[model samples]
Target: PQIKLVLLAGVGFFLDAYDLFIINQVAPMLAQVYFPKTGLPAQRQDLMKAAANIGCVVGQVMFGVLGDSFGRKFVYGKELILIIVATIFQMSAPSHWDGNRVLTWITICRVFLGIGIGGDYPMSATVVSDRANIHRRGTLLCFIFANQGWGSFVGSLVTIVTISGFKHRLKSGHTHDVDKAWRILIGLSLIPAFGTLYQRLTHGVIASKKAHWQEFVAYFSTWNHFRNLLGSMLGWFLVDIAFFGINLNQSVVLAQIGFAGKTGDVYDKLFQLATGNIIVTALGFLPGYYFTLFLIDIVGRKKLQFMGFIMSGLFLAILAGEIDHIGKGPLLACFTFMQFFFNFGANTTTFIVAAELFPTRIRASAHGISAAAGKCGAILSSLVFNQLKAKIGTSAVLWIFFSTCILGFISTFLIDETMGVDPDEKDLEERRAR
Candidate 1:
């Protein structure tokens, strides 16, 4: 039963990760296939990359309220359906449209896709947290988040296979084949999203109207609940600024390691992107997640978070310090370590902490609010990264991220350690006293 629950919840997270990161690979392909002459401008690229996250912010809040008000079961499988439908639209988005309309349509579809992805955040976290025994709660949550690493790894592997198969067609100016490849890459994610829908709907709790309204009141009825919500929300916000800034611009940084460099034409760059993504996921992203999985209970969430923040900050600072002088080999190694500390440390812990810090009645809502805040931070990064990198140079941008990590480290203090503490028991005790 436990294994089944994890799989069901983890599948959504996997699709979320796949949908979010695959865009990094797809964005360039879109430029090649649709805008072959001019290529996509930097501004359009930013909107394309950040659009889902923008939708995610809205989805998190919307689904959080719906999940709580309507009961977890009623709203559980709905987002998966939304995701599947949106993927179809995304695949069919017409490139024949004139001027920027094609990209505009694609971005709109992505926002719909993002809303589904965003809804999964609170849904999965709350359902998993509710079902797991206390002894394994944190471990289970980390494992769910860890699926993101695999999603990234799979996305990279798929890109390598798909692009290599189409290498000749792309070189022959058969841009149509490239367009088909983008659709295939996106279409693959639908399998898992669809597979999990039945289980999510069947497993959720049915709530009454009075109970739903009570949960709404409990969420904001008191100062303590409000403060707890704020702590998780703000902490997530701080982590995401650095997290998405680094992630969304991962290709930009990979350029420094010869991955996205000018040494290649479009096909060459695609191959480079695949190779770079696989290497980083293997050495950095996957390992960090497993490390957290092994040690989150042992090391405790609070300690892991602070340590992750400090180490991630330290590594970014080191990279910024030698940005100009750094060799490709050294730059890649630094980024790998940076990714390692990020996933193993802050990224996994933040979600775990948010789910555990609140009572069951408000857990999903609080987590949703926190996740929305994180997306807001991502919005800030999306708006700023390329432009900031252009104006200030890449090294200065790295330093700014380093500073955000420090702020996250400090903000870690707002949340208390939830290790081995039963929120339900605490909630019961508080109720009796009142």
Candidate 2:
């Protein structure tokens, strides 16, 4: 049952992370293909990158509440279907239309896609948090979240493979070929989404069982509830400002390493993207996740988060300060360290803490609120990063991220350390005593 739940819940995260991060790789390709003559407008580019996060802010709150009220079985895989449908619509966006119009259609589709992805955040986290045993709860949740790393890794692999197949066409300046490449990338996510849907539909209620209205009332029933919600929500919000700011602007980081396309050919740029993403994943991203996975139970969420925030801030400051003199090797190393600390320390821990801190009845809803706040932060970062990077330059923008990480570190103090406490055991004891 644990294995089944993990696969069902974890694979959803894989799709979520894939769909979210894959845009970093594909957005440039889209601009090249659909708007080859003039390039996509700045506002549209920001929307393309952040449309999902905007939808996520709403979806997390609604779905988190509904997941508690309706039961996980009913709500678990619904978002997956939404994601699949949206991906298809995105792929079908007609190239014959004006570039802005086509972009508008795709942006709308991606917003729906983001909604599904957002809904999955609480659903999957709550599912794993509810079922895993006390001794291994952190491990299980982190492992489930670790699918994000795999998603990023696989997204890079796919970009490399698919674009490489069309290498010659890209070289010949047939930038239109990028349309096919992006379709394939977006469409590939469906396999995992569909595979996980059947299990979600068939599974029984795992935890935090509540009907809709009762769950809503319980969520607001007490001062403690509100405080906990505030802690989780605000902490997540601060972390995401830095997290999504970095992930969404991966192209900018690549540009620092001289990977951004100078040739103006879509395929050549993809090759560089594939290489840069793979390098970062191997050296920084994947290691951070696995490191957290192995030690979350021992090191505890708060400590990892505290340390991660501090280190990530330190690295960002360094990068910002040394923006000019830094070579590719130093830049890559700093970026990798930043990824490591973010994942190893706070990024993974925030999800685990949010899931474990709340009771079953309000677990999904509370976590949903927290995750929604994170999405809000992500949306803000995407907007700020996109607009500010060009005008103020990368160094100035990174200092802003550094400041956000410090705020996250301070916010960590609001939520209690949840390590050692078993949520299921505590909840059951409360029921028996009553």
Candidate 3:
């Protein structure tokens, strides 16, 4: 039953990850379908990529507050409806020649999808943390978060298969299959989403207390309580800025640096790109979460986050210094290592800390605040590199990401580890050590 709950909660992360991962693969397909003879404007690319992040910010605060006001169950059951409906709209977008209206439709749908995805972060974390046994709390939370990596893995695998299946049609200029591949890739996330929806609705677990708005406001207004919130918010803000920026445009960087091939037919380029994604997802992203899942209880949040920032930052620094001159083999090796440390370090810990370090009554709202900050960072960086990458060159952008990692490293100092602490068991002042 517990394992079922983990999967139920975890499925939300998988939905979010699949959407994020598939969009990168889908963007090129959109371009090929719509503007085959001309360039799709850079503005459309930026809009398509970042709309969900903006929606995520709204979802985080709204559903988070609603969960605190009603209960996690009420909020949890509704977000998935949004995800399923929006995903259908995503697949249904007509591929017009100009595609301005179609791309706009997809972007609008993704923003709605993002709200659903964004709401899941706080709802699942709070719900899981409250009901979980304290002794195995870290493990359970990480178990849920580990789905993020799995989502990326499966997203890439599906894209690879989709592109593979349509190879003939794509190669022969019947690019209509491009439409099908993107639809199939995007639509499949709904299976797990639908599979788990009834389970989420049936959960009548009352793990957190419902408190008045004034109580919520008064509780967090203290120096002791506020600092931990500061740590939670700032760490995610810094991490996501660096994290989303790298992944959102990684295809471009990989192509620019000669890793994911620039010279190839549609099938050739897609396969090369898909294969490159598989390697990074397999070697770095997926493995990183499992390491955290296993060792988080023993290692504690503060130490893992500190180490992750330091290690991931070092790799960014190395890449920044060597981007112009590095060989593809060495570059891939370094990039994958950076991703590994990100999961094994701050990425996993950030979610863990947000779930554990706050009190139960305000847990969902607290995590929502932290997550909204991260999504805000996602938007800022989306704009940042979108605007800057054209002028500064991709080689120079790594320095900016490296700088954020350094700041993330510094942000860890604001809160201590919450390894054995039960947030609900303590008064505001009692948990002040963190």
Candidate 4:
């Protein structure tokens, strides 16, 4: 039972990464199928993408509440089913759908998908955090959550390899069904989901922290849980702003004008470039995730997370300058390296910290709330990044993101460092006075 539980818990992180990263590969196909030449305005394309983030914001809140009240296992598994259904809905966008009409259906699909993704954030992270020992919590949780980075890398790889085979057909304007590609990707998710369902099916439920409304009232009627919840929410909220905002729509920023209108190029060389760049950049974090996995217990959380913020903030601040130069391979190299450092040092650990900050009774709920805050950050980023890009240029837009990094850096100061000790010590009175 212990072994099975341990393995199942680890699987959630992988699934989270896989589902989220696959969308990166969806951009070119979406642009082609939905926004063909003489197509909807760029603003509309942006809206379709932005709508998903908006939906995610709602999903995060809904699932977080569910996680706290319902069991994490149910919430965790149910999210995948929801995502699979929503993905199919998104894939089934009307053959002739256009403009706001298309946006409406797409929005509906995104909302559903967002719910699954948002719920998973807390369910998996919180569960893993709850199960792991204190000294190893950071490392264990980091390994679990950091799978997103690798999932993205895998998504890019799948894009490159899968699309490459179709290069000739894609280039000839062979009119192959774009939906097939997405459907296949979405369907791939079901395999993992179904396989895991049985394992979760028979497991005993974790005792709910908010087992009753009155319990919730009783717990929060006191000022303490309320304050901790607020702090956890705020800290996570700030991190997600940059995390989701920057990461979610990056494909848009990276979408090459070269591939913007061409279908006969035999190879989506531009998309390939973008995917390749992301893959290479992701390598930096691949090591970081594993590093966190191994070291979270050895070195501790505060130092690693603090380093992540400082480095992520610094790299984000300088990304604009690299964008300005545009042709400097060395500059781009530095930029990717910086991204990697941020992933290793900070991004992975934030998830760990969020999981640890809240107690188990409401851990998933707290994580959900905090993750919802992050999605809120994501929502803000989605709105602002696009607007800034339109109003300003790419460099200025990146600088705005840099400001988010700065905010995250500053906010870290207020967070309690949960390293070298048990987060769930249950001796609040014992520790609080310190």
Evaluation by TM-score, superior candidate among 3 and 4 = 3
Task: Estimate, for each residue in 1-434, the C-alpha lDDT of model 1 and write its tens digit.
Answer: 55776677788888888888777777767877767777567677777678888888777767756765665575767787887888888888765666477777778877887888877775577576677646667877777888889888898899899888888566556746777888899999877766676555452345454567676775567776666666677667767777776676676678666565677566787788778988888899878999999998887887988888899889899899987887787778878888888898888788788888787876655676677788888778875777777778889988988887888888787776888888888778888998
Q: Cα deviation in Å at residue 52, candidate 1?
A: 1.1
Model 3 C-alpha lDDT per residue in residues 1-434, reported as the tens digit of each score:
55665676777777787787577667777777787766456677777778878878877767756765776556756888898899999898765534888888888998898888777775567566787637668888887778878887898888888788888565668756777788888889878877777666563233434334567778788877778888889888887777777677666667656755657777887788888888898999889899998888898899999888889889888887888887887788879888888888888888789888777777756877787788888877765666677788766788887887888889999886888888777665564765
Clashes of 3: 0
Give the Å shift of residue 100 in candidate 4.
5.5
Name model 1 segments beyond 4 Å from true: 34-39, 68-73, 168-176, 197-230, 427-434
TM-score of each: 0.88, 0.87, 0.90, 0.81
Ranking by TM-score: 3, 1, 2, 4
lDDT of each: 0.78, 0.77, 0.78, 0.60
Model 3 residue pairs with clashes: none
lDDT of 2 by residue, 1-434 (tens): 44766776677778888888888777777777776666557677778778888887767766756765675665756777888899899887776777788788888988888888777665566465565545667887788788888888898888888877888555576756678888899888877766676555553344434345476686567674456666677767877888887787676678766666568555566688778987787778878999998898787888898988889999999999987776666777888899888888888887778888777765755776677788888898876777777688889988988887898888787776788887656667755976
Name the runs in model 3 displaced over 4 angstroms. Answer: 36-40, 64-76, 168-170, 198-221, 260-262, 426-434
Q: For residue 402, what is the lDDT in candidate 3?
A: 81
Candidate number with the higher TM-score (1 or 3)? 3
